[PDB]
Amino acid sequence: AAPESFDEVYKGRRIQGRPAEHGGGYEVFVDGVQLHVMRNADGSWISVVSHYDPVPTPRAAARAAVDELQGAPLLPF
Amino acid sequence: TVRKNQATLTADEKRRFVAAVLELKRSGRYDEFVRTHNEFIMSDTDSGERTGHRSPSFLPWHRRFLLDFEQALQSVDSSVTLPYWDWSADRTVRASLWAPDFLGGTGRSTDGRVMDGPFAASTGNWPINVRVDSRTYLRRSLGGSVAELPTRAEVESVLAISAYDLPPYNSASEGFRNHLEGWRGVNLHNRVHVWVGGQMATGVSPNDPVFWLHHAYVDKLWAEWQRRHPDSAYVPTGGTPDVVDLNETMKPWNTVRPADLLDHTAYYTFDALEHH
Ligand SMILES: [O-][O-]
Ligand SMILES: [Cu+2]
Ligand SMILES: [Cu+2]
Numbered sequence: 128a129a130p131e132s133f134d135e136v137y138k139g140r141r142i143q144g145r146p147a148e149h150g151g152g153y154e155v156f157v158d159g160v161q162l163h164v165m166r167n168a169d170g171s172w173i174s175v176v177s178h179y180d181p182v183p184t185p186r187a188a189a190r191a192a193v194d195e196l197q198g199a200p201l202l203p204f
Numbered sequence: 205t206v207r208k209n210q211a212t213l214t215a216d217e218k219r220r221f222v223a224a225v226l227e228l229k230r231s232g233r234y235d236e237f238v239r240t241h242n243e244f245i246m247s248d249t250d251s252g253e254r255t256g257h258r259s260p261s262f263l264p265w266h267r268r269f270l271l272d273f274e275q276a277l278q279s280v281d282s283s284v285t286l287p288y289w290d291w292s293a294d295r296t297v298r299a300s301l302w303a304p305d306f307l308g309g310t311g312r313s314t315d316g317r318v319m320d321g322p323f324a325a326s327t328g329n330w331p332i333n334v335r336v337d338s339r340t341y342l343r344r345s346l347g348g349s350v351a352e353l354p355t356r357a358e359v360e361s362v363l364a365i366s367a368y369d370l371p372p373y374n375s376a377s378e379g380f381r382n383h384l385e386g387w388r389g390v391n392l393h394n395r396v397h398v399w400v401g402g403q404m405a406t407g408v409s410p411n412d413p414v415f416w417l418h419h420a421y422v423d424k425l426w427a428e429w430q431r432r433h434p435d436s437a438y439v440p441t442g443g444t445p446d447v448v449d450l451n452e453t454m455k456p457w458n459t460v461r462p463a464d465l466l467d468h469t470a471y472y473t474f475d476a477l478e479h480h
């Protein structure tokens with residue numbers, strides 16, 4: 128079963144996640160732009176801007192992406 | 205073709221390597237390596253097709269990818285070969301690797317921008333074009349997101365693992381390949397990506413020239429593992445869905461198999477590689 132959806136403002140940016148590059152079952156958006164994310168076999172997550180650094184949830188991956196971006200707009204993949 | 209530890213390059217060899225890298229960038233060829241890597245990063249999944257990452261072919265795939273890149277460098281300057289970064293030995297920001305005559309240093313704390321060396325954005329010679337993070341300058345934060353590079357003792361524990369890889373042949377596997385890649389265990393290759401930070405922490409990690417030196421040392425560790433376990437070899441060896449078996453061909457090239465890449469000495473040697 129997919130993780131739950133989420134919607135919050137994190138560090139001034141809107142991050143959204145929902146159940147739905149790979150056939151991969153969950154979508155995340157930063158200010159409306161989709162961020163590629165992926166789930167690992169042990170249930171951890173990564174995103175294309177933190178791809179070598181597993182975190183426990185898709186919200187954690189979205190937050191890690193906002194941290195990485197330092198205010199920059201995400202470009203669509 | 206001899207691949208040398210970066211720490212050992214002469215000033216002339218660093219000059220020639222940097223110039224060849226910058227020319228691949230200027231001509232447009234470099235960025236397609238970045239693009240190829242990101243496409244595989246994004247499509248390799250633990251429960252579906254997986255070729256470049258999180259799979260047994262992680263090591264031959266990167267071996268062929270680095271050969272393609274080294275052949276492109278040699279098309280510019282036939283004397284140049286890919287050096288390797290032994291991050292277990294050269295483990296601080298003070299390593300000559302990160303000096304302004306080679307790769308330049310860490311990024312400044314505000315925006316992570318690299319401010320010195322040949323690849324600093326201010327030179328006009330290193331636009332970041334293939335990107336997800338919209339910024340167009342090289343970034344790094346050495347030791348920012350993880351405190352330490354792997355040590356020789358940690359590498360040795362991974363080198364001692366006898367099985368090349370194991371079912372289910374993905375990021376959950378026991379075995380040498382997944383320990384070296386770093387998804388399980390004390391974590392070698394993934395941790396180095398995180399330690400450099402900036403683009404090296406992302407799916408467009410070849411945007412940083414250190415990518416190649418990191419993977420050339422990962423590649424060297426496969427060669428070391430082989431010398432430690434001459435009795436052990438690539439697996440799987442046939443009939444595995446979604447995974448590249450030993451004699452199956454690999455995308456994107458389609459014309460080469462893990463079998464064709466196990467013996468690096470068909471293509472290059474190392475400055476030093478311990479015997480069995
Ligand atoms: O994996 O780069
Ligand atoms: Cu991915
Ligand atoms: Cu890598």
Ligand SMILES: [Cu+2]
Binds near residue numbers: 480
């Ligand atoms: Cu023996």
